[PDB]
Every structure is written in structure tokens, then in C-alpha cells.
Design a protein around this ligand. Structure first.
Ligand code: NA
Length: 299
């Protein structure tokens, strides 16, 4: 189909075929974010999004999500990070190291509607130049199934205090999780391809990039970075080898989530952002220019 451009994003085609006799149909949850909003005047934001996580949880410690850290301006969804002088102290845990730290305020967004396979979800985003995680992801309301489109750390600071090296700003984590809630277990793929690096050593922080996933069926994901298929996750052995879904696969409809996180396992090793690093607000702002969603339908 050779038709006139209607949206910002039409300069970029959907990087995969919709299937034999099918075409892609844009879903109304898609947003180009070309309007103005903040927590006091949500207006157009409120038609598709809420400015919190899908449940009343403030996030992985020492993250503390705040509604007023979300806004839309200058053609982007903007998520900021700050830390007041008076911020509360939170107990942070990972493994069984244990540490009291100051909280880190940031933001989280959740879609008003859900998606389910078959579906292509693509964000055009500029990863924050921050030790904070910049995240675009999907999670079922019962917290048992998750598809991660973007999980990335954009800062050059990658050394703990110690004993670890951490994945750096040349990587995007392309993953998914399956969970049992109680007693708690987490599966994700664990192979080198899950931490995506391109051949040129692209530092993703430096510009806007398209990252999307084709959630094709419950045993097939395909990840696309700037229109190129860079990782295929196919079959029971890599989707759910421990049988946490009892054979269903990735089958439950999901909320779309966009946020930043000061993640516990990183924060406990010294990668929480310093008060000095947070003086520069552009560095600790995650930007999403747009997010688009297509499903296959009959031609
Ligand atoms: Na935009």
C-alpha cells in the first residue's frame, strides 16, 4: 500500500509483514504525544494514559513514582527524575545485602487499554543519560506475564562499588518474564543475545531510536531495532522452559508501561543517581516521541 503519510511515524514502515492476505491496522492506543499535558492539566494525556503504575505500588526501592514527574510537551512524553532534600529513607534489598538509602522520585505511565497477540508495539525513544533505567514494557494485570521492549541504562557510569561490572550504554535489554506469584519465581531468557549490542557500538542515549516487538503468538516474539529484526524468541524452551504458564505461553492481555526505575540490584551496588548527577534535569529525563501499535487484519 503506497499512500500519503498521516502521522509523524509514517516515514518508517512496519518492519515485518502482517501475513499472507493481511494488512496492519493502527490501534487507537497509539500516541504521537503532540499536545501539552502535566499532572494538573492532563487533558489529552487522560484519553489514553494514566500517570501511575497499574496498581498502587510506588516501585522497586529506592524508586518512588510520582504523578507530577510525568508530562507531555514539545512533541514527547517526558519522565523526569529528582530527589528532594527532605526525601524519605527506604530499605533496599537484593540477594540479602540490605541498605538504607534516600528515595529517588521519578515517573510511571500505564495505558488505558490492553494489547494481546498478534500485535506490533514500537516506541521511538531517547534513553536517559542516567544510571536510572529507561523502560518501555508490557505486563498482564495479574503480574504473571511480561514482555520488555526497552530496558536500558544510558549513563557512562557502569562500575559498582563493587564487586560487579554492569551492562553499559551500548546495550538494550530485550527480554520477557514469566512469574509464579507465591512462592515467587521469575523466569527470563538468560543468553548473550538478550543484551543487544550492534556491530558499530551504537551508544543508544545519543539519539532517538525505534525499538519494537512483534508479539506474534504465545511462543513467538521478534524484536526490531531501527526496523531491523535483531532477536527472535521462539519455542517453549526459551519462552517458558520451567512451565510457569502451564503450557499457555505468553497469552494474557497486557497493559503498556513506560517508566523510569532506580532498580534495587543496581542501587544496592552504588548505581543510584547522585545528587550532583540530578542537578542536570535533561540527563535524567526519558523522552518518548511516539508509541505505535498495529494488529494484523484481513486485506
Ligand atoms: Na511526537
Amino acid at each position: 500500500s503506497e499512500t500519503e503519510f498521516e502521522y509523524e511515524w509514517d516515514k518508517f514502515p512496519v518492519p515485518v509483514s502482517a501475513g499472507t492476505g493481511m494488512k496492519w491496522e493502527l490501534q487507537s492506543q497509539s500516541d504521537d504525544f503532540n499536545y501539552t499535558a502535566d499532572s494538573n492539566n492532563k487533558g489529552n494525556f487522560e484519553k489514553k494514559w494514566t500517570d501511575y503504575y497499574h496498581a498502587n505500588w510506588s516501585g522497586p526501592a529506592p524508586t518512588i513514582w510520582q504523578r507530577d514527574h510525568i508530562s507531555v510537551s514539545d512533541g514527547c512524553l517526558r519522565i523526569e527524575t529528582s530527589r528532594p532534600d527532605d526525601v524519605k529513607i527506604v530499605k533496599v534489598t537484593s540477594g540479602d545485602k540490605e541498605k538504607m538509602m534516600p528515595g529517588t522520585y521519578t515517573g510511571c505511565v500505564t495505558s488505558k487499554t490492553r494489547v494481546v497477540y498478534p500485535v506490533y508495539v514500537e516506541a521511538y525513544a531517547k534513553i536517559a543519560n542516567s544510571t536510572m533505567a529507561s523502560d518501555v514494557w508490557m505486563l498482564s494485570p495479574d503480574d504473571t506475564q511480561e514482555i520488555d521492549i526497552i530496558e536500558a541504562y544510558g549513563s557512562d557510569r557502569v562500575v559498582g562499588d563493587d564487586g560487579h561490572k554492569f551492562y553499559g550504554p551500548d546495550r538494550i535489554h530485550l527480554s520477557h518474564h514469566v512469574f509464579i506469584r507465591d512462592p515467587f519465581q521469575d523466569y527470563q531468557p538468560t543468553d548473550p543475545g538478550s543484551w543487544y549490542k550492534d556491530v558499530n557500538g551504537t551508544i543508544w542515549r545519543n539519539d532517538f531510536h525505534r525499538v519494537g516487538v512483534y508479539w506474534k503468538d504465545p511462543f513467538n516474539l521478534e524484536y526490531y531495532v531501527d526496523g531491523k529484526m535483531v532477536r527472535r524468541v521462539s519455542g517453549k524452551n526459551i519462552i517458558d522452559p520451567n512451565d510457569f504458564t502451564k503450557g499457555t505461553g505468553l497469552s494474557k492481555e497486557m497493559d503498556i508501561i513506560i517508566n523510569m526505575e532506580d532498580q534495587s540490584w543496581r542501587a544496592i551496588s552504588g548505581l543510584s543517581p547522585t545528587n550532583k548527577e540530578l542537578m542536570n534535569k535533561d540527563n535524567n529525563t526519558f523522552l518518548v516521541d511516539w508509541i505505535r501499535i498495529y494488529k494484523p487484519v484481513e486485506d
